[PDB]
Amino acid sequence: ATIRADEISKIIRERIEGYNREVKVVNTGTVLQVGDGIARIHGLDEVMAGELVEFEEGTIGIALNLESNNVGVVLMGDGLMIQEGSSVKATGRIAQIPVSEAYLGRVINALAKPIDGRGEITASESRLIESPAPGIMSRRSVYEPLQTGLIAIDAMIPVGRGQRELIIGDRQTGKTAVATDTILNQQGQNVICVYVAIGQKASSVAQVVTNFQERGAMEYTIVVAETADSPATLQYLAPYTGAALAEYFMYRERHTLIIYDDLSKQAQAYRQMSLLLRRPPGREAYPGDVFYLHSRLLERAAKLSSLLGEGSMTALPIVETQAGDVSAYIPTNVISITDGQIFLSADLFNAGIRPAINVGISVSRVGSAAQIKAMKKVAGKLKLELAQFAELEAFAQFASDLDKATQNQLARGQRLRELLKQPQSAPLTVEEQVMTIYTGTNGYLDSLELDQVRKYLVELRTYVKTNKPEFQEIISSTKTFTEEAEALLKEAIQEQMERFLL
Amino acid sequence: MEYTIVVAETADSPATLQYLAPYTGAALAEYFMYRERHTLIIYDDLSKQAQAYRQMSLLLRRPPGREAYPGD
Amino acid sequence: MEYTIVVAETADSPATLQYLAPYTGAALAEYFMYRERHTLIIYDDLSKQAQAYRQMSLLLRRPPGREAYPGD
Amino acid sequence: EKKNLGRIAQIIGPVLDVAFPPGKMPNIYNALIVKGRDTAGQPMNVTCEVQQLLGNNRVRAVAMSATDGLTRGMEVIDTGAPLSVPVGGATLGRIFNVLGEPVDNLGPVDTRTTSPIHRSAPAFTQLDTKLSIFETGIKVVDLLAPYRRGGKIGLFGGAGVGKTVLIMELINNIAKAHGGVSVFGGVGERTREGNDLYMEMKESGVINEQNIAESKVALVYGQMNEPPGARMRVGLTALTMAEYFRDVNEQDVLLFIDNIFRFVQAGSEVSALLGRMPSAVGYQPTLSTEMGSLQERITSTKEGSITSIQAVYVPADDLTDPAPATTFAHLDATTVLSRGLAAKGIYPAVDPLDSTSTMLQPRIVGEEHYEIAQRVKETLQRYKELQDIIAILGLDELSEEDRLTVARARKIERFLSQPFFVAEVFTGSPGKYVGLAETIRGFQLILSGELDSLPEQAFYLVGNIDEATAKAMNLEMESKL
Amino acid sequence: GLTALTMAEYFRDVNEQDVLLFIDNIFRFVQAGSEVSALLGRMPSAVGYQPTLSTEMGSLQERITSTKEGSITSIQAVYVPADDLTDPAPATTFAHLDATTVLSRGLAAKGIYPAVDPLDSTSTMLQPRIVGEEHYEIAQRVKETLQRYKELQDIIAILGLDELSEEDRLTVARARKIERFLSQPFFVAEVFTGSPGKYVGLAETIRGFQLILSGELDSLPEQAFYLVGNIDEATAKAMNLEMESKL
Amino acid sequence: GLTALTMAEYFRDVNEQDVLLFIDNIFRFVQAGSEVSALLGRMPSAVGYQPTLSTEMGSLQERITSTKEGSITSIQAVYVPADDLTDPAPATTFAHLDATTVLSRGLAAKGIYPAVDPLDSTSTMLQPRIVGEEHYEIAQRVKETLQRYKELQDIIAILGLDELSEEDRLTVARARKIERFLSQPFFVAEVFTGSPGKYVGLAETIRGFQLILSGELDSLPEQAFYLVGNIDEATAKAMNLEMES
Amino acid sequence: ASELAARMTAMSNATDNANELKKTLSINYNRARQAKITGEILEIVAGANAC
Ligand SMILES: Nc1ncnc2c1ncn2[C@@H]1O[C@H](COP(=O)(O)OP(=O)(O)OP(=O)(O)O)[C@@H](O)[C@H]1O
């Protein structure tokens, strides 16, 4: 560059005073050209590529790209109140973050700083940001299930602990209710969740953290929140720091669940952070590096084997398909990066189905291996039932017919699909959803109204556990839906059909 | 034609003059408007005028935006 | 085959060679065209020649144009 | 702040790169005024904002007024803080450009209390938990698609369709019902329409010619004459002029922005002028961060909500392209004003069917409100379906089961039209303000079916349900003659 | 282009005679400017041409004006690149060109040569006081009939040819006969058609279009109008075609 | 990619075996080139990639050649980005590859796995001397059927199926039967869903396609061939389908 | 009456199907417009510097 950044008059005076003289500046650098969130520093030759440099005001800067003289850094805070000529200092730790089990419940501002204000969290650091993702030998095939809570998801598109699974959708159609439902259902079985929100209007994330606080999940969850009004580098770093803050609990043999929120907004923060650098972009002006981005981000979320302790981190990123087009750039990118897709369609959520999951497109690459030995048979039968119903509804038989549906499969398929809708943020337990899936699966209840199958099954749910703890014990201990469980469930739902009739 | 100043700018006029023509006619009609007379200025091909501004600004090394039209 | 030269250029060639291959063929047929024989040249993937010339004239910092192709 | 004497080295278009002594440089977004000179002989100062630092003590700054005639090396003076906008009770009624000088020519504004343009975000200990909806004062809005108190609102409708009477009614109703106060902040407002709005305000009593600082609007007008720096920062000026209102008086402040796409267009101009590499379709790279800084300070803090209403002009009518996309990521309630409804005369012309709000859900509004709202929308859907077929068959020919649906849908579409507190100047109708309780009970009475025999025109241009029955019995009393 | 312009400008300054210059592929006079401008340091404009597209294109196409010593009639054959009608290199030439004749690939698709668009090929000389009232009314009726055919193309394409209106079916048959009849067998294109070239003045084709669109001879077969010099030639071709149909 | 290629090249060139290397997502190689040559200072190219997207990937593809010692049957799951083949990074892949199969997202959206597009998937080996005249003629006929289906897709758009005449309706029914039959429950997709895998040889699928294209199997509905292997098993599936009703 | 009602249900199916087609084609046209304009701007800006 003809206009080289380390050619300020004041700075080149420092070099011109000593040609081949007394030793260089070891860890003292003067900031210069601190503009588009990317400060540059003269000297500071001790800085490791990736070292975490500091400033005078107290703002933190990752030192990504050190050129010949200017060690260009990426300051994480706002670069507003920094003036040129200010001194900087590295600290000799490669992009670390203090992390501990005191974070469970806090609201972190992507720099391991609590933004709730009520106290400063202490820690034993032990953790880097850009750590190596677990190797191919350290990972094990996903086998343990994850009680997602939503009937549709945990029935047909199963999420397994250690299996990244994006929930791609459209704007203003769920995905945050779906993510918070997955977090909320993890009340009983211990997981150290991390709900890292990248692009969220601050009122939405405040509402979500308050909903957590009142429904109790704040005993474990970690809201690494970054507002939409945050410097682009913080919206870029927040999922990496969330992944490190959940990886600290993944390495010590404990299942975790991280949820990147609006991962399209994170890639949007990166295209901002790079088009300010004027590095060349690709399709839709993303700088092309978004794949390596979502690689460092999403390949460090899987189940480590028994060697390093059987830990896990499902990733559940939320790419917001702004277009409604699956074949955009960054949704296609994250679909290639993740182990499946849970498609939250827009037209269905406008049409009423509250978890807008449509199983036609939404598939889980971990498949039925991640489900329970109990739910696998009945969920396979239910998926085939929904295939039949989807055909019979999307296609002909509006005229009565040769095959004359609504008398073979159409009524039961409508009942099943209108059973799949959950209430807003009311997750179903494991045995509850197994019985609910079974009910419409083999065609037990077919001659109710399709209006209020939910309004019957609320009563059925409230009744079955209070009447027959044998069912809950069968599902809780053996984890297998026995024929004996089928029989006792038949009797329970018979008595509830009585209590409903009267 | 008694009352209509036809500010003509041929195409071989340089980029500056095609850029300046609407401003010239605006400065004439502005005087006539300030002295109580209702006017009516009819520009011709603002596509062509902003295209001439595009030319002169891309020559003048100003950074271009959408459709290579300059910033302003 | 006794009459058909084949100027063959692989993919592993430096992009100078995929730029010179059709010129090599054209001149080798030009000799026969001045030898009165009604020769015939067939280029294969002439998109690939312009693509390798794009490779060249973009590795020379000569500025690109439409579809990131170089100028001439 | 201090005489940070600098030279205006480079002047490209609006952008004017200034230099400084090596020690003291204003930080980013720090307003600096040049001690400029007019070619007519007046030392006119055009104010500027440092948008990008360029290293060699030279801060590239955009200009909030025309740079035509700015001499290179003219003394530029720092202010040490962002553009000091004269907030307070004083700025209640007058028209302001971005730097905060009253351009209506009435009088100088008391600059006693001034907050900077760039005050940062409020944290989560500041933002409010409960998601209370906003009882505006229009029956259509506060039944079918409620506006979120503390949240964003989008008026997709065009101009002339009735946007000005709608915003006037909203301002008068916020002054009347709550303790609130409105701040119209038109960004890139075309000065003809700006004067149209100002004169309609003055003729509506919303603001008083004679009584300033008791008015109910703080007009901040981004003209289009001004360089792209000004009609971009007018949004933030409105934001802080309303934020001081909420954080000094604890009142439900309104904030009307003219088209967010016009703000985003101004941002695109200013970024292309700065030369930073343009992003997708051509809006700036820092599009999401910029407009998030604009629209995240609009949040219900624990002092009092700053609920705003933002026009949105989608380009070529697609919500896909980034600027409407990064806007609709923010918007919490979107209500389109319909030209066909306006031509019919169902004022307000808000489309009852296509207007949607994320706040309509039951745990937010109330189970009864969500149920009656869903049933009203399903009834209006039935009516939009059968409007195809009553053209052919007629009301009596089709089934009497949903002929009642057609009749109730007529009664609903008529009941939605509210006589405003501003339409009096056009027709003399006195105007009725309708809270949520009244319209809820009235719509339950209409849709349930108690009022199946009342004439349709007894529901048109009426307020509560009791007043509607009063209009009906009035027509009955005149039916004898 | 400027060399040809200098020859014409001499023939219009000195010999005072109306010189007819032909330029073909004038778009190359902008493409070469692009290829040198990119190198010259001048920044790129829209889709990839030079920044001084308008000034250079005008600097050529403004010197061609009848200048009170003679009249330089010129016919530039612009190359609309890849049928990009919005491309700047033809878009700035549409401003300078009086009698634009937009030839369309979609009309050479069905073989109608020349593939001049009957709609878009428009002229500043189709005003009635300039051309003749009969000429103007017949051109108006032909262009309106072709616009009707283009608007009924979609109805024809999907919903069956018969399901449109019956008077509009008359308009469709009339439009078909018109858009075939406006095909000319050229003398220089005799090698591509195989048919001998036929020259027809304005009067004969005017009288032909009158009786064609007037519905009076709407009974001939369609191929009797295609690639035909004149209306009487079309009537004779209908005889020949109906004879060789049965025979 | 280069180290996989060298590993296979040592076992082909030296020890003379029929080495297979299944380089997965060779597009990621070109995208890594895009990363490095955006950061290496080299000038940018078409839409985002390096300038040498047809010489670095040329170096990867051209070293995989069946030499006189051994042959390298390589499979490369090249990944079109954003679902458009006209992209340059798989466009330069099309020129090098000779058994190109395009896995369109349409067929996987409809549920037909594998989603190999039947029109677009072509080969250099679909030749008379190479595969026999019968295989060639059947391939031509099924390509014709699917192409006419995709060409009157614009008519089984806005209008209905019943707008077609008899021959169009029959070729549409045949195309639906074929497009369904082109699905197969894989031997490794048993984890996702579907039946256990059915290995299908050429001599068995060629007979099923003779059968379907001879119109002799018109009595069967479309759901008979969906996710089945051999055509005798397809007919058995239809028989059990009618038994189950 | 039966023929005209068959034609009418064909028209209703065709109109709703063309509505679906118009929506999907508008989506394709919008992503095509964004892709075209973005590619244009990348051409222009990347050819501006030519360092
Ligand atoms: N299953 C559901 N049932 C009822 N209401 C729902 C459901 N899911 C979401 N909502 C409503 O949607 C609102 C939350 O928005 P939603 O989760 O739909 O999109 P979002 O995730 O906020 O959008 P973005 O992805 O841009 O953040 C809540 O007010 C809630 O009432």
Token readout for D61 is 């700054």
Domain covering E126-245, topology: 1.10.1140
Measure CB to CB from residue F191 to each of A282, A336, A369 and give the nearest one: A369
Question: Domain spanning D83-359: which CATH class is it, in words?
Answer: alpha beta
Instruction: Return d(Cα E182, Cα C27) in angstroms, integer.
Output: 46
Identity of the amino acid at D392: I
For residue D396, how many other CB atoms are within 10 A of its CB?
8
CB of A283 closer than 6 angstroms to any ligand 1 atom: no
Nearest CA among A43, A37, A127, A19 for reference residue A77: A37
Pocket test for ligand 1, best of A208, A319, A350, A424 (most atoms within 8 A of CB): A424
Report in angstroms the alpha-carbon separations of A334 from A164, A233, A298, D140, G32.
10, 20, 9, 41, 21
CB E139 within 8 A of CB E182: no
Phi, psi dihedral angles at A344 (to 5 degrees): -90, 95
Q: Report the nearest-CA residue for atom 18 of ligand 1.
A: A174
Residues of chain B with C-beta less than 8 angstroms from the C-beta of G37: 66-67
Residues of chain D neighbouring A116 (CB-CB closer than 8 A): 124-125
Bridge partners, D12 (sequence order): D15
Which residues in F have their CB inside 8 Å of a CB on G?
A: 43-44, 47, 157-160, 162-163
**Tokens 């509830």 belong to residue:** A496
Contacts of D285 (CB under 8 A, 6+ apart): A271, A272, A275, A276, A285, D271, D276, D277, D278, D279
Nearest CA to ligand 1 atom 30: D361
| CB neighbour class for C8 (10 Å; exposed up to 12, middle 13-18, buried from 19) | exposed
Q: Return d(Cα A453, Cα C12) in angstroms, integer.
A: 66
Run of H or E including A74: strand A71-75
Last residue of a domain, one of A329, A350, A371: A371
Is residue D415 packed enough to be buried (19+ CB in 10 Å), middle (13-18) or exposed (0-12)? Answer: buried
Question: What is the Cα–Cα distance from A163 to A141, expressed in whole angstroms?
Answer: 9
Neighbours of A215 (CB within 10 A): 15
User: Looking at the DSSP assignment, which residues form a beta bridge with residue D155?
Assistant: D311
Known catalytic membership, residue A365 = yes
What's the burial of A49, exposed, middle or buried (CB within 10 Å: 0-12/13-18/19+)? Answer: exposed
Find all residues with CB under 8 Å of A438, minimum gap 6, and list them: A378, A444, A481, A486, A489
Residue F63 in tokens: 């070293």
A370 within 8 A of A143, measured Cβ to Cβ: yes
The CA-CA-CA angle for residues G5, G8, G10, to 5°, reads: 115
- Give me the sign of the Cα torsion angle E110, E111, E113, E114: positive
Query: HEC string of E110-156?
Result: CCCCCCECCCCCCECCCCHHHHCHHHHHHHHHHHHHHHHHHHHHHHH
Distance of CA D47 to the CA centre of its chain: 26
User: Which residues have a Cβ under 8 Å from the Cβ of E224 and sit 6 or more positions away?
Assistant: E234, E235, E237, E238, E241
Decide: A476 in ligand 1 pocket, CB within 6 A: no
C-alpha A393, offset from chain centre = 33
Residue D448 structure tokens? 């349930």
Same domain for A157 and A89, yes or no, is no
Find the length of chain G.
51
Using an 8 Å Cβ cutoff, are D78 and D2 in contact? yes
In this structure, the residue with its CA closest to atom 13 of ligand 1 is: D358
Domain identity same for A350 and A488: no
3-state SS, one letter per residue, for A185-212? HHHCCCCEEEEEEEEECHHHHHHHHHHH
Residue A6 lies in a domain: no
Instruction: Report how far apart, in Å, the C-alpha atoms of D212 and of each of A267, B48, D208, D256, D394 are.
Output: 48, 47, 6, 20, 56
Identify the helix (H) or strand (E) that includes residue D427. helix D424-427
B-contacting chains (≥3 CB pairs under 8 Å):
D, E, G
CA separation for the pair D362, D379 (Å, rounded): 19
CA contacts within 13 A on the Cβ side of A400: 1
In degrees rounded to 5, what are phi and psi of residue A320?
Answer: -90, 105
Instruction: Report the interhelical angle of A330-337 vs A263-275 (nearest 10°).
Output: 120
Do residues A273 and A313 lie in contact, with contact meaning Cβ atoms separated by under 8 Å?
no
User: Residue B1: exposed, middle, or buried by beta-carbon count in 10 A (0-12, 13-18, 19+)?
Assistant: exposed
Q: Is C71 on the interface with G (CB under 8 A)?
A: no
| Two tokens, residue A67 | 């050129």
Q: Which H or E run contains D468?
A: helix D465-478
Q: What is the DSSP letter of A225?
A: E
How was this entry determined? cryo-EM
A85 domain-assigned:
yes
Residue type, position D255, single letter = L
Distance separating alpha carbons of residues D51 and A177, to the nearest angstrom: 38
Query: Are residues A354 and A423 in contact, defined by beta-carbon separation less than 8 angstroms?
Result: yes
Contact E39 C65 (CB under 8 A): no
Residues A168 and A258 in one domain: yes
The amino acid at A91: T
Contacts of D293 (CB under 8 A, 6+ apart): A229, D121, D236
Residues pairing with A194 in the sheet: A258
Q: Which two tokens stand for residue E107?
A: 């009309």
Is any Cβ of chain E less than 8 angstroms from the Cβ of F159?
yes
What are the residue ranges of CATH 3.40.50.300 in chain D? 83-359
In contact, D90 and D118? CB cutoff 8 Å: no
Please judge whether F47 and C51 are an interchain contact, meaning their C-beta atoms are less than 8 angstroms apart: no
The residue among D135, D138, D136, D140 whose CA lies nearest residue D413 is D140
Taking the CA of residue A173 as reference, the ligand 1 atom at the shortest distance is 18
> Helix/strand/coil (H, E, C) string of chain F?
CHHHHHHHHHHHHCCCCCCCCCCCCCHHHHHHHHHHHHHCCCCCCCCCCCCCCCCHHHHHHHCCCCCCCCCCCCCCCCCCHHHCCCCHHHHHHHHHCCCCCCECHHHHHHCCCCCECCCCCCCCCCCHHHHCHHHHHHHHHHHHHHHHHHHCCCCCCCCCHHHCCHHHHHHHHHHHHHHHHCCCCCCCCCCCCCCCCCCCCHHHHHHHHHHHHCCCCCCCCHHHCCCCCCHHHHHHHHHHHHHHC
Task: Using alpha carbons, select from A23, A18, A30 the residue that is nearest to residue A69.
Answer: A30
- The reply to whether C51 touches chain F by the CB within 8 Å rule is yes
Closest CA to A502 of A444, A459, A466: A459
Quickly count helices (H) and strands (E) in chain D: 14, 16
Kind of pairing, strands D154-155 and D308-311? parallel
Please give the Cα distance from B22 to B25 (Å, whole number): 5
In a 13 Å sphere around the CA of A133, the CA atoms on its Cβ side amount to: 17
Domain membership of residue A144 (yes or no) is yes
> β-pairing, D147-148 with D133-134?
antiparallel
- Burial label for C60, CB within 10 Å (0-12, 13-18, 19+), is exposed
**Residue A236 has which token pair?**
């870029």
* Residue D79 contacts residue D32 (beta carbons within 8 Å): yes
Tokens (6 digits) for A159: 């999420």
Is A171 within any annotated ligand binding site? Answer: yes
DSSP reduced 3-state for A126: coil
Place of tokens 């300059």: B70
Omega before F196 cis (within 30°)? no
- The answer to whether A163 touches A298, Cβ cutoff 8 Å, is no
Residue D30 CA to residue D47 CA, distance in Å, equals 11
Catalytic residue from among A140, A365, A454, A461: A365
Lookup: tokens for F131:
């595969």
d(C-alpha E21, C-alpha E11), whole Å: 10
Helix (H, G, I), strand (E, B) or coil at A57: coil
Domain that holds residue A389: 372-500
Q: Does B5 touch chain G (CB under 8 A)?
A: no
**CA torsion, ordered G12, G17, G22, G28, to nearest 10 deg:** 180
In angstroms, rounded to a whole number, what is the distance separating the alpha carbons of residues A458 and F49?
A: 56
Give, for D357, the enclosing helix (H) or strand (E): strand D356-357
User: How far apart (Å, rounded) are the C-alpha atoms in residues C44 and C39?
Assistant: 17
What b/e readout covers F34-68, taking b as 16+ CB neighbours within 10 angstroms?
bbebbeeebbbbbbbbbbbbbbbbbbbbebbeeee
Closest CA to E173 of E182, E191, E161: E161
Angle at the Cα of D129 from the Cα atoms of D123 and D133, rounded to 5 degrees: 120
Q: Does the bond joining F114 to the residue before it have cis omega, within 30 degrees of 0?
A: yes
Bridge partners (DSSP) of residue A128 are A96
Those residues whose C-beta lies under 8 Å from the C-beta of residue A466, and which sit 6 or more positions away, are: none
Which residues make beta-bridge pairs with D11? D16
Tokens of A468: 């027959």
Q: State whether A120 and A144 are in the same domain.
A: yes
* Contact between residue F207 and residue F216 where contact means Cβ atoms under 8 Å apart: no
- Token look-up 């630092």 returns D53
What residues contact residue B12 under an 8 Å CB cut-off, 6+ apart? E55, E58, E59, E62, E63
Residue nearest to ligand 1 atom 4, measured at CA: A424
Residue D256: strand pairing partners: D184, D309
**Residue pair A221/A183 in contact by the 8 Å Cβ criterion:** yes
Q: Report which secondary-structure segment, H or E, holds D52.
A: strand D47-53
What number does the ligand 1 atom closest to the CA of A171 have? 26
E158 touches chain F (CB under 8 A): yes
CA E21 from centre of chain = 19
Q: Could you give the count of Cα atoms lying within 13 Å of A88 in the half-sphere of its Cβ?
A: 36
8-state DSSP, A107: E
Residue contacts between D and G (CB atoms, under 8 Å):
25
- Cα separation of D434 and D443, whole Å? 12
A378 shares a domain with A335: no
DSSP state at residue A407: S
H/E element holding D47? strand D47-53
Which of these three, A69, A93, A117, is where a domain ends? A93
Phi, psi of D52 (to 5 degrees): -150, 125
Residues D436 and E244: their CA atoms lie apart, in Å, by 84
In a domain? residue A473:
yes
Residue among A166, A170, A173, A262 whose CB has most ligand 1 atoms within 8 A, to mutate? A173
Phi-psi group of C13: left, alpha or beta (phi > 0 → left; psi -120 to 50 → alpha; rest → beta): beta
A172 annotated to a ligand binding site: yes
User: Could you give the residue ranges of the DSSP H alpha helices within D352-399?
Assistant: 362-365, 367-386
Partner-chain residue, chosen from B62, B67, B72, that has the shortest CB–CB distance to D269: B72
Structure tokens at D86: 């004269």
CB contact under 8 A, E46 and B54: yes
What distance, in Å, lies between the first and last C-alpha atoms of chain B?
A: 35
CB atoms near residue A388 (< 10 Å): 18
Going by CA atoms, what residue is nearest to atom 23 of ligand 1? A172
With beta carbons less than 8 A apart as the criterion, state whether C58 and C37 touch: no
Pair A132, A85 in one domain:
no
Reported resolution in A? 4.2
CATH architecture assignment, domain D2-82: Beta Barrel (2.40)
Helix (H) / strand (E) containing D255: strand D253-257
Hey, what long-range contacts does C29-32 have (CB within 8 A, 24 or more apart)? C29/C5
Answer for the pair E164, E155: CB distance below 8 angstroms, yes or no.
yes
Q: Which of A93, A117, A137 is the last residue of a domain?
A: A93
Contacts of A24 (CB under 8 A, 6+ apart): A43, A45
Instruction: Determine the topology of domain D360-479 in CATH.
Output: 1.10.1140
Taking the CB of residue F28, how many other CB atoms lie within 10 A of it? 19
Work out the number of other CB atoms within 10 angstroms of the CB of residue E246.
Answer: 5
F27: amino acid identity, one letter: F
Give per-residue burial for E165-198: e unless 16+ CB within 10 Å, then b.
eeeeeebbebbebbbbbbbbbbeeeeeeeeeeee
Distance A357 CA to ligand 1 centre (A): 13
Q: Does any ligand 1 atom lie closer than 6 A to the CB of residue A320?
A: yes
Residue A462 structure tokens: 């409230």
Name the segment(s) of chain D with CATH classification 2.40.10.170: 2-82
Burial class (CB in 10 A: 0-12, 13-18, 19+), A244: buried
Count the Cβ atoms, other than its own, within 10 Å of residue F218.
Answer: 12
Residue A106 maps to which CATH number? 3.40.50.300
At what angle are helices A263-275 and A290-298 packed, to 10 degrees? Answer: 140
Cα distances from A374 to residues A157, A363, A431, A475, F191, in angstroms, run 16, 20, 9, 8, 16
| Mutation test residue for ligand 1: of A175, A211, A319, the one with most atoms within 8 Å of CB | A175
* Known active-site residue D190: yes
d(CA E57, CA E27): 9
How is chain C split among helix, strand and coil, in percent rounded to 5?
45, 5, 50
Residue A229 near chain D (CB below 8 Å): yes
Give the separation between CA A435 and CA A379, rounded to whole angstroms.
11
Question: How far apart, in Å, are the Cα atoms of A202 and each of A209, A319, D123, D359?
Answer: 11, 18, 8, 16
Cα gap A54→A51, rounded to integer Å = 10
DSSP E strands, D141-212: 147-148, 154-155, 181-184
Q: Rounded to the nearest 5°, which phi and psi values hold at D146?
A: -65, 150
